[PDB]
Amino acid sequence: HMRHRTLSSSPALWASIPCPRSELRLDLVLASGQSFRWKEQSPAHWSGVLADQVWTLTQTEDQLYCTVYRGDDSQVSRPTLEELETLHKYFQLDVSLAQLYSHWASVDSHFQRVAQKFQGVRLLRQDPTECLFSFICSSNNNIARITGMVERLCQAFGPRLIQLDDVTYHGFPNLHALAGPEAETHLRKLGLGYRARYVRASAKAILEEQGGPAWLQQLRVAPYEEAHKALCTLPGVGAKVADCICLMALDKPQAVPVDVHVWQIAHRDYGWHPKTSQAKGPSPLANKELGNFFRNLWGPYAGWAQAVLFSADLRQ
């Protein structure tokens, strides 16, 4: 019935935020494995869910154009001021990425080279619940398969928002929905494998053992290390997943998620080897050391620098 918008099709329905390309490149950000809910449904036009609402996003050299679909049978119109504030905080546009790039570049010749081709790679400020369960899905997995798992999970367990063309959009489920007695079996049938157990288990654990979604908001204001330890108590959440959540949803920019992907970048591009740890490959002690290595080098926004390199390492 209703259709995906472009800036030519329906130019009345869009609003804009002043934002240079040097501060934000959608195509680098929304497909770098931070969020798995965004798709380029037409060229330069990225559609995806954001807090029980669907958006489409496109950009020019110095403006970020955006439009909202409200789903319910309402009068279509441009984004409100509060909705633009939601999108401003999503991209964390208060933070000057230009000044961060040069700061990292001053102590990192490799970064300096990579920073030429890949500008405007910023961290999204994601919902903690959406981020947590998405990254439980990420273990031993790729961007394409994680996207699938998360799209099916939302169709099954989450509320319907709107259909645009063939794509039916669903919001992310609440914790109670994922914790039910049939949830593991449904999730296995939807193709998550062993991850299905961790999804249900952690949902159940956050409610019963920690008190529901407010606990994740407490971890936003708690210090990095306390939040990390707390997350590592959850089923299927280890250091890697806990750091991904810390970095991407709990405002801990120093968090450096360490698995095989930074190991490869650290070793090949920085000549890094674990010094204190004995064995030459990955281990919990060596992984921790590698996170400290990058924090020591780049400073308290170490994770934001990692994203730039990850985004670059994904592009050939």
Ligand SMILES: COc1cc(NC(=O)N2CCC(n3c(=O)[nH]c4c(OC)cccc43)CC2)ccc1C
């Ligand atoms: C953008 O910034 C971040 C993204 C994450 N995302 C993440 O770990 N995952 C798990 C696997 C990801 N991934 C692949 O499937 N192939 C990858 C690859 O091969 C060239 C290199 C790096 C990540 C890869 C997609 C989601 C973690 C930390 C940062 C700061």
Ligand code: NI
């Ligand atoms: Ni070597």
